[PDB]
């Protein structure tokens, strides 16, 4: 078995766990699950590779920071997600990354950029365009456009870092 521990990063207001519910429970709501560090268990299979169920979702809480800092250290997988209608976040995940690179020591770490909530593309403030212009800037941090509502690229995300953790 493979063991993937991913760090779902997200600014306050985005939807970190929101993606980890259509995923582990299969339900998306308007109430975005809290911000404290929540992980989600889901046994998966990558390319016929049974991978162990543990993922982490850290978010704007200085309580869980110490703990949220430990997963950056290991950072087996990073899923930084912002709202496609929220630049303020898209623009914040930029430093939060440096916090990873700061502990990892490089940007060559399993990682992916995400402009989820495409179902609000109707508002689109930062799309896979800026998102990928940003991913590029992040060194083409492999981007994806998802919709925890229309369940789009919600599964490919973890599927993109596992392919990386497979260094």
């Amino acid at each position: 078995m493979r063991e993937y521990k991913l760090v779902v990063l997200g600014s306050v207001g985005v939807g970190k766990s929101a993606l980890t519910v259509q995923f582990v429970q299969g339900i998306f709501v308007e109430k975005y699950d809290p911000t404290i560090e929540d992980s989600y268990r889901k046994q998966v299979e990558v390319d016929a590779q049974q991978c162990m169920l543990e993922i982490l979702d850290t978010a704007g809480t200085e309580q869980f920071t110490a703990m949220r800092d430990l997963y950056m250290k290991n950072g087996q997988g990073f899923a930084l997600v912002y709202s496609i209608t929220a630049q303020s976040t898209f623009n914040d995940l930029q430093d939060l990354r440096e916090q990873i690179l700061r502990v990892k020591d490089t940007d060559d770490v399993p990682m992916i950029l995400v402009g989820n909530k495409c179902d609000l593309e109707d508002e689109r403030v930062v799309g896979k365009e800026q998102g990928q212009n940003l991913a590029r800037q992040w060194n083409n941090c492999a981007f994806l456009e998802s919709s925890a509502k229309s369940k789009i690229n919600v599964n490919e995300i973890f599927y993109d870092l596992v392919r990386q953790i497979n260094r």
Binding site: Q25, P34, T35, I36, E37, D38, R41, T61, M67
Partner: protein, 86 residues
């Protein structure tokens, strides 16, 4: 901001739920039902909590009007969405 941050688990799921160290167990049980559809899968009368120890036989079933800090909980403990039923 600042509060408990326990692992309100719901079968495999682990949605951390921040509570006021003195939140009413009766409230900590009303604050989750407002979240995750799988949670409001009934009334608070069929939904309590369970501080699953390391061996649910060691785990317990908290009260309601109590106060989390009663167990002097800390943050990231292990609370489970359990049926109040009987």
């Amino acid at each position: 901001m600042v509060a408990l941050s326990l692992k309100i688990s719901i079968g495999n799921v682990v949605k951390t739920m921040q509570f006021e160290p003195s939140t009413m167990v009766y409230d900590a049980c009303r604050m989750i039902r407002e979240r995750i559809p799988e949670a409001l899968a009934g009334p608070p009368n069929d939904f309590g909590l369970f501080l699953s120890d390391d061996d649910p036989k060691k785990g317990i079933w908290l009260e309601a009007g109590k106060a989390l800090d009663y167990y002097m909980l800390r943050n990231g403990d292990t609370m489970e969405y359990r049926k109040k039923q009987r």
